Paper text:
10-Formyltetrahydrofolate dehydrogenase (FDH), which is composed of a small N-terminal domain (Nt-FDH) and a large C-terminal domain, is an abundant folate enzyme in the liver and converts 10-formyltetrahydrofolate (10-FTHF) to tetrahydrofolate (THF) and CO2. Nt-FDH alone possesses a hydrolase activity, which converts 10-FTHF to THF and formate in the presence of β-mercaptoethanol. The N-terminal hydrolase domain of FDH (Nt-FDH) binds folate and is homologous to glycinamide ribonucleotide formyltransferase (GART) and methionyl-tRNA formyltransferase (FMT), enzymes that are crucial for de novo purine biosynthesis and translation initiation, respectively. In this study, we determined crystal structures of zebrafish wild-type apo Nt-FDH (zNt-FDH) and its ternary complexes with the substrate 10-formyl-5,8-dideazafolate (10-FDDF) and the products tetrahydrofolate (THF) and formate.
The space group of this THF complex was transformed from the P21212 space group of the apo form, containing one zNt-FDH molecule in the asymmetric unit, to P212121 with two molecules in the asymmetric unit. The structure of each monomer in the THF-bound form of zNt-FDH is nearly identical to the apo form, with an r.m.s.d. of 0.65 Å for 308 Cα atoms; the central hole has a solvent-accessible pocket of similar size in the structures of both apo Nt-FDH and the THF complex. The structure of THF is complete, in contast to that of the human structure, in which only 6-formyltetrahydropterin was observed, providing complete information on the inter­action between THF and its surrounding residues. The pteridine ring of THF is buried in the central cavity and makes a stacking interaction with the side chain of Phe89. The pteridine moiety of THF is recognized by the main-chain carbonyl groups of Gln88, Ile90, Asp138 and Gly140 and the amide group and OD1 atom of Asp142 through direct hydrogen bonds and by the main-chain amide or carbonyl of Asp138, Gly140, Thr143 and Gly144, the OD1 atom of Asp138 and the OG1 atom of Thr143 through water-mediated hydrogen bonds. The hydroxyl O atom of Tyr200 exhibits direct and water-mediated interactions with the O atom of the pABA moiety within each monomer of the dimer, whereas the main-chain atoms of Ala116, Glu201 and Ile203 interact indirectly through water molecules with the O atom of the pABA within a hydrogen-bond distance. In the structure of THF-bound zNt-FDH, the aromatic ring of Tyr200 is observed to rotate by 90° to make space for product binding. An additional potential THF binding site is identified in the cavity between two zNt-FDH molecules, which might contribute to the properties of product inhibition and THF storage reported for FDH. The average B factor (52 Å2) of the THF in the cleft near the interface between two zNt-FDH molecules is greater than that of the THF in the active site (32 Å2), suggesting relatively weak binding of the second THF molecule.
Residue numbers in the entry: 1 to 308
């Protein structure tokens, strides 16, 4: 069928490539503008194949569909919209235009963790199960009926990057392909998201990823890994904003005070700079080990090297 891909990044690119190689006609690609001479991988792949590429900075203005970009989108005659990591709300004029409507990839088990940072909040909350959903776009935000859903286990030391690379990206690409295949045969279902279990969390940015030291070690662990690598959990140390990466929960070594003590504004007790990284304490007296640190305008350095 004729497909318009509305999205961005490598995930969008791979979904594009896989749908193309299943024989679908990509009549158009709608991604984000170039940033600093960097072209989105989805736009790069499509232009190569000779597929129309659009880079609208926005779809709506004054809470109303921009008619010119709606007309440019309509022109390619999509029979189905596919939205692999689309960062903006798409007007219903566009969503409802194709014969088959529009499907969206969401990296959480909907209705849980609606929102733009679902993977982060999966880990911040300490969820044991994660996964992705393919759902039909409607007029709300991540509220549309489910087409298919796939689960995976969340590992205790998973960060955003590890669970994305291991499962959410590669199985997500397959999920989108399978969904399009189900639509092509008319078998794709529409399961209304249940009320029970619906949550929504705000997008994670640097501003709201600051660490709260007054939790048990496990909760701090979840916060750090839930924002690793982006946008990076951080806290003030020595009047510097320091970001934390590569947290693992730790039983031993205890203490061992073989490491070098580091005072941290607001922590339950002093951290420890050790051979294997920065040991931090939660208010339960238990430990997590942070392997990598980062200062404002700087490359990552090992936690072991904080003083050096
Ligand atoms: N029709 C329709 N269009 C959609 C979706 C939909 O379900 N229905 N789902 C969208 C994907 N999911 C989200 C969920 C939350 C946000 C979000 O909250 N973005 C912040 C970004 C904040 C920022 O970057 O500064 C905002 O305020 O716009 C964006 C896409 C794709 N477009």
């Amino acid at each position: 069928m004729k497909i318009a891909v509305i999205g961005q990044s490598l995930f969008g690119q791979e979904v594009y490539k896989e749908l193309k190689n299943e024989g679908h006609m990509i009549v158009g690609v709608f991604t984000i503008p170039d940033k600093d001479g960097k072209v989105d991988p989805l736009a790069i792949e499509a232009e190569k194949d000779g597929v129309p590429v659009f880079k609208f900075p926005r779809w709506r203005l004054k809470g109303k569909a921009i008619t010119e970009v709606v007309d440019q989108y309509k022109a390619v005659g999509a029979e189905l919209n596919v939205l692999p990591f689309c960062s903006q709300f798409i007007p219903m004029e566009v969503i409802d235009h194709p014969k088959h409507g529009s499907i969206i990839y969401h990296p959480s088990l909907l209705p849980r963790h609606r929102g733009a940072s679902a993977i982060n909040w999966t880990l911040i909350h300490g969820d044991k199960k994660g996964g992705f959903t393919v759902f039909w776009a409607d007029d709300g935000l991540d509220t549309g009926p489910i087409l298919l859903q796939r689960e995976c286990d969340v590992e205790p030391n998973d960060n955003v990057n590890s669970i994305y690379k291991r499962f959410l990206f590669p199985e997500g690409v397959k999920g989108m392909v399978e969904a399009v295949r189900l639509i092509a045969t008319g078998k794709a279902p529409r399961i209304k998201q249940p009320e029970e279990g619906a949550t929504y969390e705000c997008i994670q940015k640097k501003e709201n990823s600051k660490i709260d030291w007054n939790q048990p070690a496990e909760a701090i662990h979840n916060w750090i890994r839930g924002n690793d690598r982006v946008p990076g959990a951080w806290a003030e140390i020595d009047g510097k904003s320091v970001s934390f990466y590569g947290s693992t929960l730790l039983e031993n070594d205890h203490f061992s005070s073989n490491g070098q003590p580091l005072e941290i504004p607001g922590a339950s007790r002093a951290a420890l700079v050790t051979k294997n990284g920065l040991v931090l304490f939660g208010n339960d007296g238990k430990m997590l080990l942070v392997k990598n640190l980062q200062f404002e305008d700087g490359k990552m350095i090992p936690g072991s090297q904080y003083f050096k």
